[PDB]
Design a protein around this ligand. Structure first.
Ligand SMILES: NC(=O)c1cn([C@@H]2O[C@H](CO)[C@@H](O)[C@H]2O)c2ncnc(N)c12
Ligand SMILES: CC1=C(/C=C/C(C)=C/C=C/C(C)=C/C=O)C(C)(C)CCC1
Lengths: 225, 214, 346, 324
């Protein structure tokens, strides 16, 4: 069923060991195969390796070979993937597949997938955001409507939330998806479009709240000379 | 394994259109194909199993047909919630499982040009030792666009990162940020920061630029 | 040529049918050459019903010294009958042969159907093989409950009736164990359908029939035995070595359930061989393979067979393409032989 | 009268050139030319060269396969033996004599050659009849609740011999006579004149009725029935491609089989009958060699038809040729 909840979350260092473990229940694992399917963030679905109860056939994908050691349990229906070599492509919101066994020799798709809990492979340390103003565009795109924003840079772990004027401004706000930088720290920009005529007559302050470090920074954004 | 090749790579169709996407497996897998709907930050939903048999609790606008090597998923009437990436899959009960490359179904609307804004790095940004110049392309359609960064007319490559917002609920436009990252030391040896935007909505490349001082 | 004409005349007779001695049965074409002499179709003039008549030629009996084998088949089949063991109707003799007249199975034999399903694609698909395996199991079980070791079982001795249900037949290479033994030596059976124990001349129990079941199931799907290649069968000596030494190979045509099941039966050692361990034959039935089979309905004959034989086109063997064995080179019968011949007739 | 009757010869070239004497002592060149004798000798050599291997193979192959040893092949073996009688009795003698251009074995030789040639051809004739009977009985089933066994086959074989002797033996005891036919290098039955004084007339009537008309009726009956049966059966069995192909094949074969019986004995019957109904019909000496050509060639074409064109024999021959 839908109850295939990862309980193997948390950061784990590259080359480390963490045993991803399916909280599988609502069915009996012996007519199904709990082979590990990984939805990598903003990227397509892939297969890791086969899992079987009685049958005991296990086969890897040709890209995770010997970097994981499959294991299984039918006393709780948990399927444990041992981690023992990791890269950075082993970051995914892991899900547990559930695949029907035939009714003659029938192959089906994967009936259910998990609710996931994020697993990350990273060497980066905790560090709140430095919040810099992205000053108004008024040296080009003059008059009418001007855009301004805040660059929220060098934070980790994700997420970071950005609001404007303590949540009083949220209209016309486009908060872009995070991009992984070379450092191993995420950065994004949040922008808001405002009247060019309101500039230097209204203060626009981005209120940045990074929950993992409990780091809150209110950074004023004003036209510069 | 058995390679799964999705076609078309992307398509753009309006609401209430009949959309058929095709998937070709390199080797025949018999009737043993599935189709998924993936919308970002959600669990994949199974649509079709056995190449053509609907999964329970899936709308009846989705259907699949065909066998051999050429498999199909058909959406009879497109909806504004059928903005998704659709993945085909081959299954085997004694072989590998392999997925497609995804077919991007885009919800179509009229062409729109981007309003182009360039934002200076502040002095505060310079203190960290980095200068980020951010270019915003606001409310344009289609999603595809090309941003070219030029500093002093020198092409910038391999030091800029692009991020595109997920489709706006405002009117079904896209916005795109292109962030050019330089050192402070490079920034202070430069002057002209130009963001050139080439897009379908535009009839010529539009350059927005500023000179250092902000 | 003439063989098609003879087949056509049989078909003509069948059509009429659908709608002792040699002076009591009108004789048609042979349907095979059994273990002992011919097995031809024939018809009672007194009721207009078709029967197969396994004739055991007096000549061929003397040559092979097949006197024991004849008596065994008679006494066992005469006493033992089920829904998966053919009825025996008459035991008389004629001028030149001893006769056992048994009920028709004008649907052909499983061996025939392996290649007849499609010449360029021999062997059945998974549902059809599974179905037949389940029916064979019920027939074997019926023998085992009566404490009979068959020591053989092969596709050509598994006959289809008109409906498309299969039955085992021919109990001439069997032995009925008494209470006081549970294992016995021998060398009974046809090579390749004989278990390791049989070949080594060792004592064996009921196990050997389950080995044969494994060989049968494998052969239905792959169109070859576990111990020989497609459309080839090696010499008895080499075949004996294959059975004893070789581990079974499998394609992925098999489902995991069928693969595992087949392995369990083709296991070498009676103790690890799935089947009757003198507990139940229903331990075998618990295997996941039979989740697609309803045993209660199977035993009651209420399940629809996967293939239904045509009632016009007969799938019995062509006459001149059946087996053969030499008749005597001048060799005149012993007193003993004559005494057996009179005794056989009832 | 198309020839000249004598005490023990019948030249089918009438005496009117004043050189026509006994062809047992006179070289014949006044009713044939030297080239015609060379062609005769060539032809007789051919019939031996083909006939002996074909018939030897028929006997040979049967010993090596179980299924051939069955009762229904006995008559076929008998046919092959019959043909061989014609080869060594008729053909070989005629080959020797032709190169002298006349018959050099004398009146006694003529009786010998005529006996073996007739015996051969008659066993062959009655074999074809018996074979047709067996096919009719087995397939059309006029009598039911009987099994065809070894004994019945043997009776069938014996019957052909008895009927053959019934024809070959009479000209030796003066009921008709053997006398030279054709180019005077083979001896046939006298029927060229139904002359009372030599008893030709009664013999010709006996032959025509019992040994041609009777066979002809039986052959037509049996094969007519067989084709009828097979068409009906095939109509009720159009659920197999094989049966339809077979039906066409069998019908074609039966036409060939009937024609082959006709060709062999019809010339003798035709000529004899015409001469019986009206006497004064003149024919040449070479004309009387024509019936002999047709009859003698059946030693080759009968086993080709009745052995080679059967599935069972074919398989067996291939196995034996590929080591056996
Ligand atoms: N003994 C029997 O009752 C029969 C054996 N055969 C054929 O005879 C062959 C040799 O046993 C088999 O493979 C079948 O083709 C049969 N064919 C049809 N009906 C039957 N009752 C039998
Ligand atoms: C005269 C005659 C017959 C038989 C003739 C035979 C048997 C001739 C054989 C000649 C040979 C064998 C030459 C070489 C028939 C057709 C029965 C009836 C018509 C009269």
């Amino acid at each position: 069923e839908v109850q295939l909840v990862e309980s193997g979350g948390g950061l784990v260092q590259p080359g480390g060991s963490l045993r991803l473990s399916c909280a599988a229940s609502g069915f009996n694992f012996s007519s199904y195969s709990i082979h590990w399917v990984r939805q990598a963030p903003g990227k397509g679905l892939e297969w890791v390796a086969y899992i079987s109860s009685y049958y005991g056939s296990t086969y890897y994908a040709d890209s995770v070979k010997g970097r994981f050691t499959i294991s299984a349990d039918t006393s709780k229906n948990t399927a444990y993937l041992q981690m023992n070599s990791l890269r950075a492509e082993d970051t995914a919101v892991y899900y547990c597949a559930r695949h029907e066994y035939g009714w003659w020799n029938d192959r089906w798709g994967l009936d259910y997938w998990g609710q996931g809990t994020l697993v990350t492979v990273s060497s980066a340390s905790t560090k709140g955001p430095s919040v810099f103003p992205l000053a108004p565009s008024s040296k080009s795109t003059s008059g009418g409507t001007a855009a301004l924003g805040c660059l929220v840079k060098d934070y980790f772990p994700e997420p970071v939330t950005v609001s404007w004027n303590s949540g009083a401004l949220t209209s016309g706000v486009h908060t872009f998806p995070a991009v992984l930088q070379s450092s191993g720290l995420y950065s994004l920009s949040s922008v808001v479009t405002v009247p060019s005529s309101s500039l230097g007559t209204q203060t626009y302050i981005c209120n940045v709240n990074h929950k993992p470090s409990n780091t809150k920074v209110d950074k004023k954004v004003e036209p510069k000379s | 394994d058995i390679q799964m090749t999705q076609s078309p790579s992307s398509l753009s169709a309006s609401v209430g259109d009949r959309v058929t996407i095709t998937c070709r497996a390199s080797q025949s897998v018999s009737s043993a194909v599935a189709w998924y709907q993936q919308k970002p930050g959600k669990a994949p939903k199974l649509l079709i199993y056995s190449a053509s048999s609907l999964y329970s609790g899936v709308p009846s606008r989705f259907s699949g047909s065909r066998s051999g090597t050429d498999f199909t998923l058909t959406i009879s009437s497109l909806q504004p919630e059928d903005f998704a990436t659709y993945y085909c899959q081959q299954s085997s009960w004694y072989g590998p499982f392999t997925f497609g490359q995804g077919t991007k179904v885009e919800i179509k609307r009229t062409v729109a040009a981007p309003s182009v804004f360039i934002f200076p790095p502040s002095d505060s940004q310079l203190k960290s030792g980095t200068a980020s110049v951010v270019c915003l392309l606001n409310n344009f359609y289609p999603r595809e666009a090309k941003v070219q960064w030029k500093v002093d007319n020198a092409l910038q490559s391999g030091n800029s990162q692009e991020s595109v917002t997920e489709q706006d609920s405002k009117d079904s436009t896209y916005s795109l940020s292109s962030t050019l990252t330089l050192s402070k030391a490079d920034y202070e040896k430069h002057k002209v920061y130009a963001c050139e935007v080439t897009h379908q909505g535009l009839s010529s490349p539009v350059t927005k630029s500023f000179n250092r001082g902000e | 040529l003439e063989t098609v004409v003879a087949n056509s005349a049989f078909i003509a007779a069948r059509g009429s049918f659908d709608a002792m001695g040699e002076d009591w049965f009108l004789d048609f074409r042979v349907l095979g050459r059994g273990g002992f002499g011919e097995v031809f179709a024939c018809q009672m003039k007194a009721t207009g019903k078709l029967y197969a008549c396994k004739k055991l030629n007096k000549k061929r009996l003397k040559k092979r010294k097949g006197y024991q084998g004849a008596m065994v088949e008679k006494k066992i089949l005469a006493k033992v009958h089920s829904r998966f063991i053919v009825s025996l109707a008459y035991a008389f003799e004629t001028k030149t042969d001893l006769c056992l007249v048994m009920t028709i199975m004008n649907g052909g034999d499983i061996r025939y159907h392996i290649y007849n399903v499609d010449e360029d694609n021999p062997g059945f698909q998974e549902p059809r093989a599974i179905f037949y395996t389940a029916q064979i199991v019920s027939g074997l079980e019926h023998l085992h409950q009566r404490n009979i070791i068959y020591r053989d079982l092969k596709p050509e001795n598994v006959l289809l009736d008109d409906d498309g249900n299969v039955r085992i037949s021919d109990l001439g290479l069997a032995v009925e164990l008494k209470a006081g033994q549970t294992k016995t030596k021998g060398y009974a059976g046809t090579p390749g359908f004989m278990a390791p124990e049989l070949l080594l001349g060792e004592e064996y129990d009921f196990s050997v029939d389950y080995f044969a079941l494994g060989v049968t199931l494998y052969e239905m799907i792959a169109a070859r035995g576990p111990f020989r290649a497609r459309g080839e069968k090696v010499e008895n000596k080499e075949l004996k070595q294959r059975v004893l030494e070789q581990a079974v190979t499998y394609p992925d045509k098999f489902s995991p359930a069928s693969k595992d099941f087949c392995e369990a039966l083709l296991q070498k050692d009676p103790e690890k061989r799935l089947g009757f361990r003198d507990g139940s034959c229903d331990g075998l039935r618990t295997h996941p393979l039979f989740r697609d089979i309803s045993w209660r309905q199977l035993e009651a004959g209420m399940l629809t067979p996967p293939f239904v034989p045509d009632s016009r086109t007969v799938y019995a063997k062509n006459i001149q393409d059946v087996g053969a064995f030499e008749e005597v080179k001048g060799v005149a019968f012993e007193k003993a032989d004559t005494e057996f011949f009179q005794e056989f007739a009832s | 009268m198309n020839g000249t009757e004598g005490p023990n010869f019948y030249v089918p070239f009438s005496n009117k050139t004043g050189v026509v004497r006994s062809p047992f002592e006179a070289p014949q060149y006044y009713l044939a030319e030297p080239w015609q004798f060379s062609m005769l000798a060539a032809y007789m050599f051919l019939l031996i060269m083909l006939g002996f291997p074909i018939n030897f193979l028929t006997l040979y192959v049967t010993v090596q396969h179980k299924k051939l040893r069955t009762p229904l092949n006995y008559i076929l073996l008998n046919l092959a033996v019959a043909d061989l009688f014609m080869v060594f009795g008729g053909f070989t003698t005629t080959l020797y004599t032709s190169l002298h251009g006349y018959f050099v074995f004398g009146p006694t030789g003529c009786n010998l050659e005529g006996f073996f040639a007739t015996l051969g051809g008659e066993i062959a004739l009655w074999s074809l009849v018996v074979l047709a009977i067996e096919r009719y009985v087995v397939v059309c089933k006029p009598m039911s609740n009987f099994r065809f066994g070894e004994n019945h086959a043997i009776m069938g074989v014996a019957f052909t011999w008895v009927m053959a002797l019934a024809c070959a033996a009479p000209p030796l005891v003066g009921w008709s006579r053997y006398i030279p036919e054709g180019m005077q290098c083979s001896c046939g039955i006298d029927y060229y004149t139904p002359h009372e004084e030599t008893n030709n007339e009664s013999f010709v009537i006996y032959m025509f009725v019992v040994h041609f008309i009777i066979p002809l009726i039986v052959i037509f009956f049996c094969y007519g029935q067989l084709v009828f049966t097979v068409k009906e059966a095939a109509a009720q069995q159009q659920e197999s491609a094989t049966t339809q192909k077979a039906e066409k094949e069998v019908t074609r074969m039966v036409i060939i089989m009937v024609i082959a019986f006709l060709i062999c004995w019809l010339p003798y019957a035709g000529v004899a009958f015409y001469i019986f109904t009206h006497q004064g019909s003149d024919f040449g000496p070479i004309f009387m060699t024509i019936p002999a050509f047709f009859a003698k060639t059946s030693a080759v074409y009968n086993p080709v038809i009745y052995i080679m064109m059967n599935k069972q024999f074919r398989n067996c021959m291939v196995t034996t040729l590929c080591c056996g």
